[PDB]
C-alpha cells in the first residue's frame, strides 16, 4: 500500500520506541527500589529526565537538516541511544554512572527523534494521498513499540533484573540499526541535502563534542532538579519576553499552553498513576495476575486500537478542547473510583484504571497527536523549538505535581494512601475541567483568528 522505505522507517521507529519505553515504564520504580530514592525524589527526577528527553529534540532536527544529513543523524542517534541503554545496564555495577547513562539517553533521543519522521515525509511525492495514512501508521508504530515495552519490561525486570531489561533496550536499538543498515539502499535517493555531499568531519566533531558536553549537562540537571527548574523557568520567561516583544501566531501560542496542561497530565502515567496502580488497585484482571507497573501499557493499547477508528472518523480549537475534556474525565474517573468504589481493604477494580487510560489516550489523540501537525498550519523552526521546550517545562511541572501523591516507604495500609490519590486526582480533574471550559469559551474567538 505504501512505498518500500515506509516499512523500513516503520520498524526502525518501532524498535527505537521499544528501547525508550522499556526505560520509561520501570524508571520511577528503579529510582525507588534500586537507588533508594523517596517517591518524591523519584518523581521529580523522572520529570527532569523526561524534560531533557523531549526538550532537546530541536537539536537533532538542526543536525539532520544542516550539518550531517537526516540519514547520517538517524545512524548517529541510534548509536548514542544504544550506548545509553547499555550504560544504564552498566549502572548496576557502577551506580555512580546512572545520571551519565540517563544523560546519554536524553542526548541520543535529542539527536534521533526528528529524523525518521523527516525521512518518512520525503518517501512520498509532495501531494501523495497516502501521506495522512502514512503518519497515522507511523504513530501506531510508535505505540506498538511502546505497548510491547510497557507490557513486558516490568515483568522482565522483576524476573531477571534491571541489567537484562536495559541491555534488551540496547538490543532493540541494535535491531533498529540493523534494519536501517540492511534497508539503506531503499532510501538511497531520499535525505536532506548534507546526506548527498560527503560527510564533513569538522561538523561531525562539533556534534560529538557538543553531545558529550550535553550528556554531562543533562546528568548535572537530573542530579540537581532545583536548578533544572530555574534553567527552564528563565529560558521560558525569556522566550516568553522575546515572543511577546515580537495574529495566527497567537493561536499557536494559546494552543501551546493548552498542550502544556496535557503534558503535565501525561507525565502522571509513569509516576503518580503508576504508584496508584501499585498501591490501591487489584493486580488481577480477567483472572490473570499482572505486574501493576505494566498498567502503563494501557496508554499505547488504547492508542493502537483508537487511531484507525478516529482516523476513519470546531476544527482547531474544538478538537483541542475535546481532548482536554477527555483528560479531565480520566482524572475525575480515578478520583471517583477511589472515593466511592473501593474495597473495604482500600483496593479498587482495575476496570476503573482501564477507563482512566482510555480517557487519557483519547485526550492524547485530540491534542498531541494532532498538535504540531496543525501548529504547522498556523505558522517555523523557532516555534518547533519552543513547542518541544514547553513540553519539557510540562514534564518538569508534571513531576512536581506528582510529588503530591508521594507515599513514605513505611506506609503499608491502602486506606491511608487512597485518600491522598483521590484528593490529588480529583483536584487535577477539576482544574483540567476548568481549563477545558475556558478553552470552549475561547473556541469562537480562536476560530475567527484562524480565518
Amino acid at each position, epitope marked *: 500500500q505504501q512505498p518500500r522505505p515506509f516499512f523500513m522507517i516503520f520498524f526502525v521507529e518501532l524498535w527505537e520506541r521499544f528501547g525508550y519505553y522499556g526505560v520509561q515504564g520501570v524508571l520511577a520504580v528503579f529510582f*525507588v*527500589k534500586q537507588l533508594g530514592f523517596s517517591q518524591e525524589q523519584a518523581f521529580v527526577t523522572f520529570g527532569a529526565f523526561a524534560a531533557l528527553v523531549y526538550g532537546l529534540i530541536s537539536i537533532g532536527g538542526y543536525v539532520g537538516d544542516h550539518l550531517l544529513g537526516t540519514k547520517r543523524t538517524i545512524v548517529l542517534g541510534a548509536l548514542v541511544l544504544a550506548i545509553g541503554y547499555f550504560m544504564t545496564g552498566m549502572s548496576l555495577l557502577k551506580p555512580d554512572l546512572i545520571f551519565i547513562a540517563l544523560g546519554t539517553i536524553a542526548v541520543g533521543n535529542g539527536l534521533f527523534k526528528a529524523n525518521p519522521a523527516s525521512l518518512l515525509s520525503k518517501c512520498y511525492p509532495p501531494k501523495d494521498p497516502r501521506l495522512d495514512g502514512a503518519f497515522t501508521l507511523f504513530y501506531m508504530s510508535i505505540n506498538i513499540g511502546s505497548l510491547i515495552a510497557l507490557s513486558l519490561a516490568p515483568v522482565i525486570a*522483576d*524476573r531477571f*533484573g534491571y541489567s537484562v531489561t536495559y541491555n534488551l533496550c540496547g538490543a532493540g536499538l541494535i535491531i533498529a540499526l540493523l534494519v536501517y543498515i540492511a534497508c539503506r539502499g531503499m532510501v538511497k535517493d531520499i535525505g536532506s541535502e548534507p546526506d548527498f555531499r560527503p560527510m564533513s568531519f569538522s561538523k561531525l566533531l562539533y556534534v560529538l563534542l557538543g553531545s558529550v558536553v550535553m550528556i554531562f549537562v543533562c546528568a548535572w540537571l537530573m542530579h540537581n532538579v532545583e536548578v533544572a527548574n530555574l534553567v527552564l523557568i528563565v529560558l521560558s520567561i525569556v522566550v516568553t519576553i522575546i515572543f511577546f516583544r515580537q495574529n495566527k501566531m497567537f493561536v499557536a501560542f494559546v494552543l501551546m499552553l493548552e498542550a502544556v496542561v496535557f503534558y503535565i497530565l501525561y507525565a502522571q502515567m509513569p509516576t503518580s498513576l503508576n*504508584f496508584f496502580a*501499585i*498501591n*490501591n488497585v*487489584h*493486580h*488481577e484482571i480477567l483472572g490473570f*495476575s499482572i*505486574n*501493576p*507497573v505494566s498498567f502503563q501499557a494501557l496508554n499505547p493499547f488504547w492508542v493502537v486500537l483508537a487511531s484507525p477508528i478516529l482516523a476513519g472518523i470546531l476544527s482547531m480549537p474544538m478538537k483541542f478542547t475535546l481532548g482536554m475534556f477527555m483528560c479531565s474525565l480520566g482524572f475525575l474517573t480515578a478520583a471517583a473510583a477511589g472515593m466511592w468504589f473501593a*474495597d*473495604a*481493604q*482500600g*483496593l479498587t477494580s482495575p476496570w476503573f484504571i482501564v477507563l482512566v487510560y482510555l480517557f487519557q489516550s483519547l485526550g492524547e489523540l485530540f491534542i498531541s497527536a494532532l498538535g504540531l501537525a496543525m501548529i504547522a498550519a498556523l505558522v517555523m523552526g523557532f516555534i518547533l523549538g519552543m513547542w518541544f521546550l514547553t513540553q519539557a517545562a510540562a514534564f518538569l511541572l508534571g513531576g512536581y505535581v506528582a510529588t503530591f501523591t508521594a*507515599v513514605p*516507604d*513505611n*506506609i*503499608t*495500609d*491502602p486506606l491511608e*494512601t487512597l485518600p491522598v490519590y483521590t484528593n490529588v486526582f480529583g483536584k487535577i480533574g477539576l482544574v483540567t475541567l476548568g481549563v477545558a471550559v475556558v478553552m470552549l469559551l475561547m473556541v469562537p474567538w480562536l476560530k475567527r483568528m484562524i480565518a
Partner: nanobody, 122 residues
Framework: VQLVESGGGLVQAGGSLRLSCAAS????????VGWFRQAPGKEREFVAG???????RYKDVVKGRFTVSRDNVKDTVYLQMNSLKPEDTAVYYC?????????????????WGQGTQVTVSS
C-alpha cells in the same frame, strides 16, 4: 510467583518457631509478603507482614511476640514466633503482592504458598 513456606511444626506454649518464605523465579524484593493463618473452622486472617521497603504491619494479638523480617541477600522472608500460645495453632501461609502495600484480606494478594501447620500445645 510460587512461594515455599517452611519451618512449621509442633511446639509447647511459650516456645518458638521460625517460618520462612522463599520465592522461585522472581525476586521477592519487589513484593510485600504477608503472613496469613487459618485456624480450624475459621477464615484466613492477616497475621504479619513486611512490604518491599521495610514497612511493617501486625495483627494486634501478635504484637510483642511475632517479628517479620527479610533477608534480601537470601531473597527470603521470615516470621519469628516467640511466646507461642495454643490459640496461635493454624495453617500459616505466606502471600506476596507487588509493591509497598500490605492489604488485610487474602484477595489483595495474587501469589500464595501452600501452607505450613503450626501447632502449639498447652
Amino acid at each position: 510467583v510460587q512461594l515455599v513456606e517452611s519451618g512449621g511444626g509442633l511446639v509447647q506454649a511459650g516456645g518458638s518457631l521460625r517460618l520462612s518464605c522463599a520465592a522461585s523465579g522472581p525476586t521477592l524484593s519487589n513484593y510485600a509478603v504477608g503472613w496469613f493463618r487459618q485456624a480450624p473452622g475459621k477464615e484466613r486472617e492477616f497475621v504479619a507482614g513486611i512490604n518491599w521497603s521495610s514497612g511493617l504491619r501486625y495483627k494486634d494479638v501478635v504484637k510483642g511476640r511475632f517479628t517479620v523480617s527479610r533477608d534480601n541477600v537470601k531473597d527470603t522472608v521470615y516470621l519469628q514466633m516467640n511466646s507461642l500460645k495454643p490459640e496461635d495453632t493454624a495453617v500459616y501461609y505466606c502471600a506476596a503482592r507487588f509493591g509497598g502495600m500490605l492489604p488485610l484480606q487474602p484477595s489483595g494478594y495474587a501469589n500464595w504458598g501452600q501452607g505450613t501447620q503450626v501447632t502449639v500445645s498447652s
